[PDB]
CSV table of all heavy atoms in Angstrom, one decimal:
chain,number,residue,atom,x,y,z
A,7,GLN,N,106.8,118.2,113.3
A,7,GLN,CA,107.4,117.3,114.3
A,7,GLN,C,108.8,117.9,114.6
A,7,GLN,O,109.3,118.8,113.9
A,7,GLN,CB,107.5,115.9,113.6
A,7,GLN,CG,108.0,114.8,114.5
A,7,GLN,CD,107.4,113.5,114.1
A,7,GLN,OE1,106.3,113.4,113.6
A,7,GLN,NE2,108.2,112.4,114.4
A,9,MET,N,111.8,117.3,113.9
A,9,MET,CA,112.8,116.9,113.0
A,9,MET,C,113.1,118.0,112.1
A,9,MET,O,112.2,118.8,111.7
A,9,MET,CB,112.3,115.7,112.1
A,9,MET,CG,111.9,114.4,112.9
A,9,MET,SD,111.2,113.2,111.8
A,9,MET,CE,109.8,114.2,111.1
A,11,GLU,N,113.6,118.1,109.0
A,11,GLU,CA,113.0,118.0,107.7
A,11,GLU,C,111.5,118.5,107.9
A,11,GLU,O,111.0,119.2,107.0
A,11,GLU,CB,113.0,116.5,107.3
A,11,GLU,CG,112.0,116.0,106.3
A,11,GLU,CD,112.7,114.8,105.6
A,11,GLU,OE1,113.5,114.1,106.2
A,11,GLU,OE2,112.5,114.6,104.4
A,40,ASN,N,104.1,111.2,115.3
A,40,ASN,CA,102.9,111.1,114.5
A,40,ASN,C,101.6,111.0,115.4
A,40,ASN,O,100.6,111.5,115.1
A,40,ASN,CB,102.9,110.0,113.4
A,40,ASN,CG,102.8,108.6,114.0
A,40,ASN,OD1,103.7,108.2,114.8
A,40,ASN,ND2,101.7,107.9,113.7
A,59,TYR,N,104.5,109.9,107.3
A,59,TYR,CA,105.3,108.9,106.6
A,59,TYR,C,104.4,107.6,106.5
A,59,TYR,O,103.9,107.2,107.5
A,59,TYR,CB,106.7,108.6,107.2
A,59,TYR,CG,107.4,109.9,107.4
A,59,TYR,CD1,107.2,110.7,108.5
A,59,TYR,CD2,108.4,110.3,106.4
A,59,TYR,CE1,107.9,111.9,108.7
A,59,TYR,CE2,109.1,111.5,106.6
A,59,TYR,CZ,108.9,112.3,107.7
A,59,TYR,OH,109.5,113.5,107.9
A,62,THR,N,104.9,104.7,109.0
A,62,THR,CA,104.7,105.1,110.4
A,62,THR,C,103.2,105.1,110.8
A,62,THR,O,102.8,104.5,111.8
A,62,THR,CB,105.4,106.4,110.6
A,62,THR,OG1,106.7,106.3,110.2
A,62,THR,CG2,105.3,106.9,112.1
A,102,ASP,N,111.2,109.1,100.2
A,102,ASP,CA,111.0,108.1,101.3
A,102,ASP,C,112.1,108.4,102.3
A,102,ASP,O,113.3,108.3,102.1
A,102,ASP,CB,111.2,106.7,100.7
A,102,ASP,CG,111.0,105.5,101.7
A,102,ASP,OD1,110.6,105.7,102.9
A,102,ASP,OD2,111.3,104.4,101.4
A,103,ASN,N,111.7,108.8,103.5
A,103,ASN,CA,112.6,108.9,104.7
A,103,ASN,C,112.5,107.7,105.6
A,103,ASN,O,111.8,107.7,106.6
A,103,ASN,CB,112.3,110.3,105.4
A,103,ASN,CG,113.4,110.6,106.4
A,103,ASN,OD1,114.4,109.9,106.6
A,103,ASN,ND2,113.1,111.6,107.3
A,104,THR,N,113.4,106.8,105.3
A,104,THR,CA,113.3,105.5,106.0
A,104,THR,C,114.3,105.4,107.1
A,104,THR,O,115.4,106.0,107.0
A,104,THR,CB,113.5,104.3,105.0
A,104,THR,OG1,113.3,103.1,105.8
A,104,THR,CG2,114.8,104.3,104.3
A,105,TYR,N,114.0,104.7,108.2
A,105,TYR,CA,115.1,104.2,109.1
A,105,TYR,C,116.2,103.5,108.2
A,105,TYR,O,115.8,102.7,107.3
A,105,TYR,CB,114.6,103.2,110.1
A,105,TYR,CG,113.6,103.7,111.0
A,105,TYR,CD1,112.2,103.3,110.8
A,105,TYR,CD2,113.8,104.6,112.0
A,105,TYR,CE1,111.2,103.7,111.7
A,105,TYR,CE2,112.8,105.1,112.9
A,105,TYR,CZ,111.5,104.6,112.7
A,105,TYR,OH,110.6,105.1,113.5
A,106,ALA,N,117.4,103.6,108.5
A,106,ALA,CA,118.5,103.0,107.7
A,106,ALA,C,119.7,102.7,108.6
A,106,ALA,O,120.2,103.6,109.3
A,106,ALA,CB,118.9,103.9,106.5
A,137,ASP,N,117.0,106.5,117.7
A,137,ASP,CA,116.2,107.7,118.2
A,137,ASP,C,115.4,107.3,119.5
A,137,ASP,O,115.4,106.2,120.0
A,137,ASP,CB,115.3,108.2,117.1
A,137,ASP,CG,114.1,107.3,116.8
A,137,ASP,OD1,113.5,106.8,117.6
A,137,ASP,OD2,113.8,107.2,115.5
A,143,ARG,N,108.5,101.1,119.5
A,143,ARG,CA,107.5,101.1,118.5
A,143,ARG,C,107.0,99.7,118.2
A,143,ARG,O,107.8,98.7,118.3
A,143,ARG,CB,108.1,101.7,117.2
A,143,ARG,CG,107.9,103.3,117.1
A,143,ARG,CD,108.0,103.9,115.7
A,143,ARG,NE,107.1,103.3,114.8
A,143,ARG,CZ,105.8,103.8,114.6
A,143,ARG,NH1,105.4,104.9,115.2
A,143,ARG,NH2,105.0,103.1,113.7
A,146,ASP,N,107.0,98.2,113.3
A,146,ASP,CA,108.3,98.6,112.6
A,146,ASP,C,109.4,99.0,113.6
A,146,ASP,O,110.4,99.6,113.2
A,146,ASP,CB,108.0,99.7,111.6
A,146,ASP,CG,107.8,101.1,112.3
A,146,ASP,OD1,107.4,101.2,113.5
A,146,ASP,OD2,108.0,102.1,111.6
A,184,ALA,N,119.8,105.6,111.5
A,184,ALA,CA,119.7,107.0,110.9
A,184,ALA,C,118.4,107.1,110.1
A,184,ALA,O,117.7,106.1,109.9
A,184,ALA,CB,120.9,107.3,110.0
A,185,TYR,N,118.1,108.4,109.7
A,185,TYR,CA,117.0,108.6,108.8
A,185,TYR,C,117.7,108.8,107.4
A,185,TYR,O,118.6,109.7,107.3
A,185,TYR,CB,116.2,109.8,109.2
A,185,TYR,CG,115.5,109.7,110.5
A,185,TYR,CD1,114.8,110.8,111.1
A,185,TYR,CD2,115.4,108.4,111.2
A,185,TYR,CE1,114.1,110.7,112.3
A,185,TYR,CE2,114.7,108.3,112.4
A,185,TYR,CZ,114.0,109.4,113.0
A,185,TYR,OH,113.4,109.3,114.2
A,186,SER,N,117.2,108.2,106.4
A,186,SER,CA,117.8,108.2,105.0
A,186,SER,C,117.9,109.6,104.4
A,186,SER,O,118.9,109.8,103.7
A,186,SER,CB,117.0,107.2,104.1
A,186,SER,OG,115.7,107.7,103.8
A,187,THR,N,117.0,110.5,104.7
A,187,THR,CA,117.1,111.9,104.2
A,187,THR,C,118.1,112.8,104.9
A,187,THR,O,118.2,114.0,104.4
A,187,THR,CB,115.7,112.6,104.1
A,187,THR,OG1,115.1,112.6,105.4
A,187,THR,CG2,114.7,112.0,103.1
A,209,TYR,N,108.5,104.5,103.8
A,209,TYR,CA,108.2,105.8,104.5
A,209,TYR,C,108.1,107.0,103.6
A,209,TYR,O,108.8,108.1,103.8
A,209,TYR,CB,109.3,106.0,105.6
A,209,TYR,CG,109.3,104.9,106.7
A,209,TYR,CD1,110.2,103.8,106.6
A,209,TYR,CD2,108.4,104.9,107.7
A,209,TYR,CE1,110.2,102.8,107.6
A,209,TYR,CE2,108.4,103.9,108.7
A,209,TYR,CZ,109.3,102.9,108.7
A,209,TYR,OH,109.4,101.9,109.6
B,301,CHT,C1,111.5,109.4,109.3
B,301,CHT,N1,111.2,108.1,109.8
B,301,CHT,C2,110.2,107.5,109.0
B,301,CHT,C3,112.4,107.4,109.7
B,301,CHT,C4,110.7,107.8,111.2
B,301,CHT,C5,109.5,108.7,111.7
B,301,CHT,O1,109.7,109.9,111.8
Side-chain angles (χ1 to χ4, degrees):
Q7 184 150 333
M9 298 171 304
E11 162 150 27
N40 73 297
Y59 306 85
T62 302
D102 182 6
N103 189 7
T104 182
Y105 301 107
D137 69 46
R143 274 196 59 90
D146 74 336
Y185 295 173
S186 66
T187 53
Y209 295 101

